[PDB]
Amino acid sequence: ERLPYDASKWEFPRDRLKLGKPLGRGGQVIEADAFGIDKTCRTVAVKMLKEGATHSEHRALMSELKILIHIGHHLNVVNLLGACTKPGGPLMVITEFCKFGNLSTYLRSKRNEFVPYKVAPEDLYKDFLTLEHLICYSFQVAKGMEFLASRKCIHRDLAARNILLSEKNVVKICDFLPLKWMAPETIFDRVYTIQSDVWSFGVLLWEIFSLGASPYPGVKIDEEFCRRLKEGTRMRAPDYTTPEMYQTMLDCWHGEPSQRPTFSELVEHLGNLLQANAQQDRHHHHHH
């Protein structure tokens, strides 16, 4: 809100947008066509308020926009393309469009199209999810969080429902029961810090390697849940996890926030895990 707004760089004409079917509601996000928004026609996502909403919501939408302008560009964070702020129409924030939707559902739908890895004749696993994909998505989300962390940002709601999937397996962090993703201090003291987001990154990890599963299955989210979380109880390994990966899930869920890895340590670690899987996959593919 204190951050300045460079209209000469981000302002887009309202009549250069044809709004289409809605995506989500909470303001509301919509799919759309933007003409000339980049250097001829492109698909975009527009977040706009309603008719007569609370001046506050306007203020909120504006500050959300300035935050995005502040954060900057990174391949793994939803990209801001423009915004209509001047008088004449409603306030709109325009970002790139990700066709495949949130990561959880996308994964949830590939449960009948998964193989640990591929070998000849690999044409039987066309459009199949594999460990490499899963670790790759985890690597990218980590890089985007290391980025955001590097800018003093704090997501506060990092989950699979807030990860978008684009062309060529590129995931992006965006921001549209949350208790299931919160760390102990965040639930009991109401404290949000970069470390608590790592806690959540851990919950995200579990979601990915459980192909879109809901965390803490069958548990009610009542007082007992909160107590067990506080006493050291943790989720069991998901169905598509590897041993190293599950352990990383455990590290992120460390009770002592300072003892949780950092997003830089996580990037460093997943990068390696990805490179090893790759190597094994090369040997698997070579022999058979």
Ligand SMILES: O=C(Nc1cncnc1)c1c(Cl)ccc2c(Nc3cccc(C(F)(F)F)c3)noc12
């Ligand atoms: O959901 C959005 N776009 C979108 C893209 N593709 C498919 N569906 C929706 C979106 C739109 Cl239309 C406008 C602003 C933001 C947005 N802003 C944001 C605010 C604070 C922090 C962050 C993040 F950097 F943490 F991601 C993003 N995240 O996601 C959006």
